[PDB]
Amino acid sequence: KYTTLSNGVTVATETNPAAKTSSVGLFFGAGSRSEHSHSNGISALTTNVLASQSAKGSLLTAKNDREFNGIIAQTTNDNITEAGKLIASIASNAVDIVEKTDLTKHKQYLSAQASAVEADPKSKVLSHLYSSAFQGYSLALPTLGTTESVENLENQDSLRHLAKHLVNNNTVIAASGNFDHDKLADAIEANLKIAEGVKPEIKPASFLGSEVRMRDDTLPKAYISIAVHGEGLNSPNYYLAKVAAAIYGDFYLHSTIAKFTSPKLASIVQEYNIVESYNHYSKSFSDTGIWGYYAEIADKFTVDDFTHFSLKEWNRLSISISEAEVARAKAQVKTALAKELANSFAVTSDIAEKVLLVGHRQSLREAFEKIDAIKVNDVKEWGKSKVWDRDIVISGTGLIEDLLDYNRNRNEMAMM
Amino acid sequence: ATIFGGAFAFQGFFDVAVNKWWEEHNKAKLWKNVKGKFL
Amino acid sequence: EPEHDDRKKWGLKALVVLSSLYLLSIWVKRFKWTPIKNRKFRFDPP
Amino acid sequence: MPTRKSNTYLSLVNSYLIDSPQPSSINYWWNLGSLLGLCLVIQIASGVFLAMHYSSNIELAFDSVEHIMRDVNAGWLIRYIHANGASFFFICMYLHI
Amino acid sequence: VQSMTSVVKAANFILARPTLSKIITPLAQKFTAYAGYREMGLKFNDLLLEETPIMQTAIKRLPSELNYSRNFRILTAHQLALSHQLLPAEKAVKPEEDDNYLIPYILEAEKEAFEKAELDNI
Amino acid sequence: VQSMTSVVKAANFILARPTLSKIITPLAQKFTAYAGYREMGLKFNDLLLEETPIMQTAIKRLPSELNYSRNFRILTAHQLALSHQLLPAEKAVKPEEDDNYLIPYILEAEKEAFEKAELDNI
Numbered sequence: 156k157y158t159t160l161s162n163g164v165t166v167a168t169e170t171n172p173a174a175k176t177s178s179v180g181l182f183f184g185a186g187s188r189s190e191h192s193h194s195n196g197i198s199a200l201t202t203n204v205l206a207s208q209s210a211k212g213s214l215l216t217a218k219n220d221r222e223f224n225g226i227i228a229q230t231t232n233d234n235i236t237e238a239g240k241l242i243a244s245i246a247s248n249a250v251d252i253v254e255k256t257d258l259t260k261h262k263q264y265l266s267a268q269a270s271a272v273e274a275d276p277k278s279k280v281l282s283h284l285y286s287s288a289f290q291g292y293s294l295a296l297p298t299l300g301t302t303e304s305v306e307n308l309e310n311q312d313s314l315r316h317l318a319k320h321l322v323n324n325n326t327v328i329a330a331s332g333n334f335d336h337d338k339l340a341d342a343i344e345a346n347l348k349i350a351e352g353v354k355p356e357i358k359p360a361s362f363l364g365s366e367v368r369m370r371d372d373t374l375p376k377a378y379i380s381i382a383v384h385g386e387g388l389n390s391p392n393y394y395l396a397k398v399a400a401a402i403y404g405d406f407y408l409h410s411t412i413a414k415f416t417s418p419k420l421a422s423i424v425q426e427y428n429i430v431e432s433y434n435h436y437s438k439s440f441s442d443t444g445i446w447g448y449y450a451e452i453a454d455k456f457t458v459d460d461f462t463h464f465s466l467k468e469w470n471r472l473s474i475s476i477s478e479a480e481v482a483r484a485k486a487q488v489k490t491a492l493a494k495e496l497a498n499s500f501a502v503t504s505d506i507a508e509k510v511l512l513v514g515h516r517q518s519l520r521e522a523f524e525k526i527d528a529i530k531v532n533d534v535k536e537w538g539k540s541k542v543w544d545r546d547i548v549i550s551g552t553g554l555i556e557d558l559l560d561y562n563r564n565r566n567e568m569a570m571m
Numbered sequence: 572a573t574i575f576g577g578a579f580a581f582q583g584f585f586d587v588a589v590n591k592w593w594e595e596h597n598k599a600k601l602w603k604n605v606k607g608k609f610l
Numbered sequence: 611e612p613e614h615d616d617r618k619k620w621g622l623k624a625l626v627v628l629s630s631l632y633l634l635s636i637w638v639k640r641f642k643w644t645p646i647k648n649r650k651f652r653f654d655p656p
Numbered sequence: 657m658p659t660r661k662s663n664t665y666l667s668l669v670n671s672y673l674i675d676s677p678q679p680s681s682i683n684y685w686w687n688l689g690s691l692l693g694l695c696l697v698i699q700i701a702s703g704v705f706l707a708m709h710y711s712s713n714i715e716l717a718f719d720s721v722e723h724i725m726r727d728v729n730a731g732w733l734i735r736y737i738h739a740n741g742a743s744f745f746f747i748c749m750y751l752h753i
Numbered sequence: 754v755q756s757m758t759s760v761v762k763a764a765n766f767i768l769a770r771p772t773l774s775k776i777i778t779p780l781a782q783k784f785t786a787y788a789g790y791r792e793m794g795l796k797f798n799d800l801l802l803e804e805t806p807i808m809q810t811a812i813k814r815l816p817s818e819l820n821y822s823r824n825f826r827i828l829t830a831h832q833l834a835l836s837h838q839l840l841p842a843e844k845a846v847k848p849e850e851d852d853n854y855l856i857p858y859i860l861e862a863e864k865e866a867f868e869k870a871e872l873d874n875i
Numbered sequence: 876v877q878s879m880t881s882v883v884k885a886a887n888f889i890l891a892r893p894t895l896s897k898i899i900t901p902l903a904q905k906f907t908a909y910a911g912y913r914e915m916g917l918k919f920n921d922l923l924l925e926e927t928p929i930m931q932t933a934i935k936r937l938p939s940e941l942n943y944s945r946n947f948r949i950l951t952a953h954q955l956a957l958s959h960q961l962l963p964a965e966k967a968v969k970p971e972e973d974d975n976y977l978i979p980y981i982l983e984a985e986k987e988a989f990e991k992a993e994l995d996n997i
């Protein structure tokens with residue numbers, strides 16, 4: 156349900172009587188993708204400063220996504236309207252709050268987060284993969300900025316960022332839970348007061364096949380990731396890309412089902428225990444995406460074997476995927492979509508992301524209908540178009556001596 | 572395979588090109604062109 | 611040297627084939643080595 | 657494992673040709689070895705095709721060589737290879753030393 | 754191969770005597786500049802023949818920072834040789850940065866080996 | 876190689892029919908007696924071709940006591956073939972001790988493999 160208030164801001168809510176808890180949040184787009192190297196991380200810092208305000212009993216948290224930012228005030232159902240007002244206040248006084256703020260403490264917090272994403276091997280690998288894939292464009296920048304750039308941010312920078320991006324045309328109030336939509340809309344309208352402005356032009360980005368290798372021989376595993384130019388939220392292949400990713404699905408060697416998971420790659424890598432774990436994903440940004448896998452290999456001598464087998468299984472995508480695999484992938488993608496949309500916090504984040512970045516959100520039933528329309532031939536056409544023989548972007552962290560340089564993995568993308 | 576057949580394309584192309592350029596560069600010297608004078 | 615004429619014709623064909631193939635090999639090697647000759651490193655210890 | 661590693665024969669071929677971890681800074685001089693090997697094939701190959709026509713008797717050795725040059729279809733080519741290829745074998749060996 | 758013990762013995766034999774020092778040391782710097790390894794980012798001790806148990810021990814007993822710097826310099830030298838290009842004068846290794854960082858560890862390794870050999874023939 | 880599942884299918888196909896049972900089973904006992912493996916301490920399941928993934932898994936999933944007994948029987952058979960001698964009739968494996976101990980595990984491995992193959996072609 157949608158209602159465009161005065162100021163032109165849009166309130167989008169997905170109310171469900173069965174919701175355990177309610178959530179309402181203001182999102183104003185312009186994540187890291189809107190920043191540049193010198194002032195990178197300013198969006199995350201501003202959102203953290205706003206989210207650090209008095210919560211009046213609610214749970215105020217920052218979002219800090221790649222392309223959009225926002226503050227979400229989780230709260231029980233009956234309190235939702237209050238939370239509404241809260242965030243409205245927090246955003247009608249955003250410039251005042253930033254001005255009166257001593258950014259020191261918030262900057263050590265953001266630097267701690269930036270170090271965290273540079274220590275968690277998967278976070279580091281995926282951040283490096285995104286940076287190298289879209290190198291040269293703002294989309295390459297970290298969501299939370301780097302430790303070198305965070306410390307160089309000042310209040311005036313955050314004020315300029317808010318003035319540019321915290322405008323009615325670039326902001327959305329998303330909500331979910333069990334409440335009357337009209338009550339929340341009325342409560343926010345009386346309290347929301349933000350500057351006018353045009354929606355900032357979203358910066359361009361183009362995929363560039365590349366390889367980045369942070370080899371740290373002191374780590375205990377090899378955390379690699381390989382991906383191709385995926386499908387953005389706009390592309391009609393979005394769900395098709397998710398189905399293609401789920402065809403290969405996840406795998407954890409020590410999990411009980413490791414010996415029974417359907418995907419062929421799982422059966423292949425367990426013969427010599429090539430890999431410890433992997434997960435296929437289709438990350439989707441506003442207009443471009445990254446479709447691939449992340450993997451952790453325990454045996455440093457089998458990174459090449461895993462890459463070879465995974466890329467061969469990708470080659471299967473354009474030739475030999477059976478109706479069983481396509482049906483399994485469809486069912487698993489539908490279940491994953493429904494799982495991702497259970498928590499009211501997740502529903503609010505999803506509503507904000509879609510409404511800001513594509514303008515319209517497909518209901519879950521519409522998404523199910525769109526996925527069920529996929530046939531095996533559609534998946535193979537997508538594999539031919541986007542996976543078969545397309546440039547790949549690679550990343551690795553530790554014990555990657557066995558990760559053969561680009562040309563080997565790239566040539567694996569087209570050998571039968 | 573198609574390697575076997577395709578090799579014929581290039582071999583024949585170069586062979587005919589050279590066997591058509593050679594008897595043009597050397598037409599005044601080859602036998603088949605000089606035999607008329609001595610017959 | 612009764613093979614003189616045949617020898618030099620075969621030589622012309624061989625030079626054509628091998629020169630085209632050598633140029634192709636030069637191109638292929640430079641192309642497949644572009645990733646290596648374009649590597650850029652960083653060393654950033656504390 | 658990949659067929660190029662599981663099979664012992666292909667495992668050897670891989671260890672020597674497909675995955676031999678060569679250093680990244682080797683010049684073209686390091687290619688000479690391959691050429692030498694190539695030449696070893698050529699010397700053998702053409703060689704095996706000369707003994708099919710060469711008669712080792714002292715009263716036939718030179719006449720047999722001339723029979724190769726003049727009578728065998730590509731005999732001139734095989735002899736000129738087997739000889740100039742030996743000269744090139746030693747050129748490449750001196751360069752490799 | 755000549756041991757760093759003997760190389761340093763000869764070098765200190767020369768350096769102690771002022772005449773030989775004055776004659777050689779300018780020639781030593783000139784030779785080390787014409788050697789051309791500094792233009793590829795390598796310090797002298799990077800050139801040392803690693804493939805010996807003494808030298809392998811010496812590297813295996815380097816500090817962390819020196820080990821990583823050596824790794825990066827060797828990789829840079831490999832890349833420069835690979836791409837047939839040299840570091841500009843401003844980026845090359847200056848004479849004062851060629852600090853003979855690995856010599857002490859090699860000398861300690863050779864001291865240990867020489868004591869072991871001497872005591873085995875006590 | 877014949878999958879053990881097929882062997883048991885054929886064996887029960889024969890055993891179920893009283894005429895074929897009465898004919899074969901005497902010949903079955905006579906054939907296993909003339910085979911000569913029992914005089915070397917081997918039970919039937921010791922003879923099975925070990926070098927197969929299914930069989931190797933079956934061996935890997937044997938109980939400890941059965942595994943050690945099998946190891947000793949195989950070692951004894953090797954020693955007997957080495958010394959060119961046979962066990963005395965009182966020490967040879969009696970027909971009652973030839974108990975088909977490994978077949979259940981082999982059949983379980985075959986069942987798992989066949990289920991995996993069937994589902995992979997669902």
Ligand code: HEM
Binds near residue numbers: 696738
């Ligand atoms: C690295 C290995 C070899 C080298 C360097 C080599 C080199 C040579 C050279 C320089 C000649 C002189 C021929 C001439 O001057 O006309 C010759 C002759 C000959 N070689 Fe080889 N050769 C090699 C291996 C072989 C092998 C494996 C065979 C097997 C048949 C072979 C068969 C012959 C024969 C039959 C001749 C007689 C030459 C003739 O009749 O024209 N050679 N070899």
